[PDB]
Amino acid sequence: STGMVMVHEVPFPPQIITSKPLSLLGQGITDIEIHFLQVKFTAIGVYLDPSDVKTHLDNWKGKTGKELAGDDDFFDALASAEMEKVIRVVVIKEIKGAQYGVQLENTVRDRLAEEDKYEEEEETELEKVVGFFQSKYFKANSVITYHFSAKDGICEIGFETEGKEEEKLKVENANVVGMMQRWYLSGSRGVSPSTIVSIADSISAVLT
Ligand SMILES: [Ca+2]
Ligand SMILES: [Ca+2]
């Protein structure tokens, strides 16, 4: 309708409208070096409302993108902030959904255990997220979306692929929802350093 933003040759809508318009403030990819070369697995887009950024992260105004990208307290504040966020992930390298699911599980479980926040309630919820992804095949251009509610720690996961009606999963465990968000939104521990740098630069501009 209004064009698409190309993130590593993958189209992303400039905005996504939930309760209000959210702008693509962060973009990047997840990759791994194999045989001396960069292998791109997914393209990522993080959507936030600039007004929410101004309302909840005003304490970081004046900071440069470089300063924000190197500060985990900033990203913890972004994750803790009661404003919605949408994380859109498009598959570049086709893989079994289980590969993505177990990577998520590994990091989320490890971090929750580190904070002594991994009991049977969290384990059960996390297993449902893993089960959601393992029943799917990630063809290139398949889209995974994470919609984080502003409050009450809720996340709705969506999976869309050509030919099938979109599939969704509602996650309600606050600890799991919070750590899933931090899997992407983490200064030094984010799965996509490129997206982190991008978000930092955008928010710096928003607050400046
Ligand atoms: Ca218990
Ligand atoms: Ca119990």
From Swiss-Prot:
It catalyses: a chalcone = a flavanone. It is an enzyme of class 5 (isomerase). One of its GO terms (biological process) is flavonoid biosynthetic process. The keyword DNA damage does not apply. It holds the Pfam family Chalcone. The gene is CHI3. InterPro entries: Chalcone_isomerase, Chalcone_isomerase_3-sand, Chalcone_isomerase_bundle_sf, Chalcone_isomerase_sf, CHI3-like. Signal peptide: none annotated. Pathway: Secondary metabolite biosynthesis; flavonoid biosynthesis. This is Probable chalcone--flavanone isomerase 3.
